[PDB]
Design a protein around this ligand. Structure first.
Ligand SMILES: O=C(O)CNC(=O)C(=O)O
Ligand SMILES: [Mg+2]
Ligand code: NI
Ligand SMILES: [Zn+2]
Length: 331
């Protein structure tokens, strides 16, 4: 069995290997990459996402989100308070202000220490979940707006044609902006490209051990667990590496820098934080290997998780017994 310790693997495809996206994912899996839940892909030196970022300041962040924490430093939830619209140029100036900027630090490890010590005492503002793309239309390789759709994959594998669309999302971050512990909708893959700015640190639990994280989360957030049988779908809970180690939960960590891709694999729980002002693009995708994970994915029916239009058909075809209850949650 390849990669039996479930380590995060890093890949350096050549420009020739960068042509065929599906083939390269399958290659990484042949080497055991999926066992970690997360892989890094460094693009060939010849490749670029677009010519420059000199012209992005006029993108609008219609609903910036202030991420307010509750709990203790290593075990907390966050809620999102909506703020007034601002441009990316306005948000970048805010990120660089004395109130929000990255503190002085020695290296990524010192910064990670400071994040876990101090995160709860601040409320950073995240420009998350903005429909759109920064890839040039002429970029032919690993262009996240030109990928094969999940609807087309389901049709190819299973024969059934369904409604729905699959488009990318932009994320503008600042110091301490946080993504809570989660898997993707319907336990899909994700791919994330860091277009510019400061790094993003990731934590990940191997898919074979995801239920150990779920059992810990039920213990640590006991009210939330009584409220919903899949409350990590709410994407509000944080647990630090120190607390995971104290509880014996297998995990790994890695830092993504500008110009690098990360892929998350079906049922790979992940969480993390941004080091300073940055911009990332991400989208969900599927392969043949996903279908069995989609059939078994948990679902929130309490009403909190509220998701996209396109998830209806996935539930309806892959999970017909759950469909009725899940849709009551959505309405
Ligand atoms: O970058 C973020 O805030 C969160 N990203 C992801 O969870 C992802 O790409 O799957
Ligand atoms: Mg602009
Ligand atoms: Ni994710
Ligand atoms: Zn729920």
């Amino acid at each position: 069995a390849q990669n039996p310790n479930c380590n995060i693997m890093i890949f350096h495809p050549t420009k020739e290997e960068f042509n065929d996206f599906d083939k390269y994912i399958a290659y990484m899996e042949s080497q055991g990459a999926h066992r970690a839940g997360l892989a890094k892909i460094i693009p060939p030196k010849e490749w670029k996402a677009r010519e420059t970022y000199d012209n992005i300041s006029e993108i609008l962040i219609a609903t910036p989100l202030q991420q307010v924490a509750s709990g203790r430093a290593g075990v907390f939830t966050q809620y999102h308070k909506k703020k007034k619209a601002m441009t990316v140029g306005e948000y970048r100036h805010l990120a660089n202000s004395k109130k929000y900027q990255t503190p002085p630090h020695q290296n990524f490890e010192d910064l990670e220490r400071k994040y876990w010590k101090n995160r709860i005492y601040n409320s950073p503002i995240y420009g998350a979940d903005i429909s759109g793309s920064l890839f040039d239309e002429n970029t032919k390789q690993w262009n996240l707006g030109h990928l094969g759709t999940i609807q087309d994959l389901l049709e190819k594998e299973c024969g059934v044609v369904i409604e729905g669309v699959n488009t990318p999302y932009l994320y503008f971050g600042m110091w301490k902006t946080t993504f809570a512990w989660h898997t993707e909708d319907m336990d899909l893959y994700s791919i994330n490209y860091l277009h510019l700015g400061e790094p993003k640190t990731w934590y990940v639990v191997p898919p074979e051990h995801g239920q150990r994280l779920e059992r810990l989360a039920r213990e640590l957030f006991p009210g939330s667990s009584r409220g919903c049988g899949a409350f990590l779908r709410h994407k509000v809970a944080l647990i630090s590496p120190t607390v995971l180690k104290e509880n014996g939960i297998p995990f790994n960590r890695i830092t993504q820098e500008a110009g690098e891709f990360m892929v998350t694999f079906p049922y790979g729980y992940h969480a993390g934080f941004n080091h300073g002002f940055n911009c990332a693009e991400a989208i969900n995708f599927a392969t043949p290997r996903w279908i069995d994970y989609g059939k078994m994915a948990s679902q929130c029916s309490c009403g909190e998780a509220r998701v996209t239009f396109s998830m209806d058909a996935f539930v309806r075809i892959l999970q017909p017994e759950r469909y009725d209850l899940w849709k009551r949650g959505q309405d």
